[PDB]
Design a binder for this molecule. Structure first.
Ligand SMILES: O=c1ccn([C@@H]2O[C@H](COP(=O)(O)OP(=O)(O)O)[C@@H](O)[C@H]2O)c(=O)[nH]1
Ligand SMILES: [Mn+2]
Length: 439
């Protein structure tokens, strides 16, 4: 068995890094198709496309000469939750005649007229989703061998193949694949898996297709790729052996002189040797802070890019850090798909108002099911969330390679988070300790 995940990008997203980590945890051999190449498959958000996925898959298949079983899948919004033995057993059971199995889903798209051409079935999971499929290398090769246009629609291509041929079967019972979109009430997390209570199955591949990225990101916080080490926090005093260089980017407003002094005093007490400090002041109105810049109304990345710093540590004036070893603690969490980390702090006079959002609806705050549990530390860890504010540690691989300056909301903190979401760079809130408060 080989898993061919489509990851066409010059630099890796957190989606692909997460997919790789889940593949490794489940002993799945995999190739990232299209790694290092520029995406030309279209703006999938506002328009369909994805033909380039087919063309890159075809090139990859030229390296795989034997007729082996292959899974072909999305990577940005998809993870495996089990290993090759379960996959092979399910495949054999689903298709004794070794057909290509595609994911099912709730909706018939992009061509509504196909509704009446699909086989009639006694399930809501009626239609093809082209985001995950499995079959023999030669069968898949035969379907795609003439290539397509980069901007052709791969969803439509495979829908037509299903309807018109006998080469494809759909995974109606969600055994191998789960298209999660609008199936929230079917699904629970149990024993490190998704359980679909509608189908009575444990789907191997969890696909947060469309807006269900939010749901998969949510469930991620409850899954494991390795056991918790319960002793990681037993001493809450963290010290790095060798300190990477951290660029402190302080967003200040000297108009509020007393708030500024108090903030700078706390920042000066963060224990870290290898650093450079820049002050970015909103006011137009300094001996202790040579790198001082005035009239700044946006987040600034160019000074960091020109530096040799390994991390960018964004701190806003209204966030008061009290945990002196916090930078050591945060850096220890930066690995794999965990590259943007924000410690959870609450407002001093009502700690349920924090510096993250658990959910988002049309770009605005929505209360997630576990929001209050995180804010009150009923459960702790790292959580993939749509917005973080005020204290953000970002690895250089993010800041040096991605446009963090995209504009939607005309608000610096909201637009930074929009930028990251758009690039499939994840924001992780961490609430393992008491870090501070907001004013
Ligand atoms: O720059 C890009 C954009 C997308 N994709 C791949 O195309 C898939 C389809 O996009 P998406 O999952 O967002 O589509 P959806 O499942 O929401 O229709 C992604 O998961 C990736 O595997 C890629 O490789 N590079
Ligand atoms: Mn997808």
């Amino acid at each position: 068995l080989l898993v061919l995940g489509i990851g066409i990008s010059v630099h890796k997203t957190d989606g692909v890094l997460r997919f790789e980590k889940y593949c490794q945890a489940h002993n799945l051999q995999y190739m990232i198709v299209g790694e290092g190449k520029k995406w030309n498959g279209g703006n999938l958000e506002s328009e369909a496309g994805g033909g380039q996925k087919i063309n890159e898959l075809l090139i990859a298949l030229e390296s795989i000469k034997d007729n082996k079983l292959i899974v072909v899948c999305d990577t940005y919004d998809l993870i495996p939750l089990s290993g090759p033995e379960e996959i092979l057993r399910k495949y054999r059971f689903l298709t004794p005649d070794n057909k290509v199995v595609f994911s099912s889903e709730l909706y018939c798209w992009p061509d509504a007229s196909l509704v009446e051409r699909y086989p009639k079935v006694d399930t809501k999971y009626k239609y093809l989703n082209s985001g995950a499929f499995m079959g023999y290398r030669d069968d898949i090769y035969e379907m795609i061998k003439n290539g397509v246009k980069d901007r052709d629609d791969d969803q439509l291509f495979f829908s037509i193949k299903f309807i018109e041929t006998d080469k494809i079967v759909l995974d109606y019972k969600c055994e191998l694949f789960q298209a999660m979109y609008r199936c929230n009430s079917d699904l629970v997390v149990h024993k490190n898996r998704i359980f679909n209570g509608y189908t009575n199955s444990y789907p191997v591949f969890a696909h947060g297709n469309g807006p269900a990225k939010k749901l998969l990101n949510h469930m991620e916080g409850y899954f494991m790729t390795e056991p918790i080490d319960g002793s990681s926090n037993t001493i809450n005093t963290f010290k790095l052996d060798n300190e990477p260089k951290v660029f402190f980017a302080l967003y200040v407003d000297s108009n509020d002189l007393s708030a500024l002094k108090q903030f700078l005093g706390k920042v000066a007490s963060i224990q870290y040797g290898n650093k450079v400090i820049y002050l970015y002041d909103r006011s137009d109105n300094q001996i202790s802070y040579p790198n001082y810049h005035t009239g700044v109304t946006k987040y600034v990345f160019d000074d960091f890019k020109k530096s040799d710093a390994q991390f960018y540590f964004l701190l806003e004036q209204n966030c008061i850090i009290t945990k002196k070893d916090i930078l050591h603690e945060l850096i220890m969490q930066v690995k794999d798909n965990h590259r943007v980390i924000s410690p959870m702090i609450g407002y001093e006079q009502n700690s349920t108002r924090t510096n993250f959002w658990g959910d988002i609806e049309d770009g605005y705050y929505k209360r997630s099911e576990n929001y209050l549990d995180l804010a009150k530390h009923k459960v702790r860890g790292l959580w993939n969330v749509p917005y973080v504010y005020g204290v953000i540690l970002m690895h250089e691989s993010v800041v040096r390679n991605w446009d963090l300056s995209m504009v939607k909301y005309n608000d610096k903190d909201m637009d930074l988070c929009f930028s990251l979401r758009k690039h499939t760079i994840f924001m992780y809130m961490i609430n393992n300790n008491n870090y501070g408060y907001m004013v």
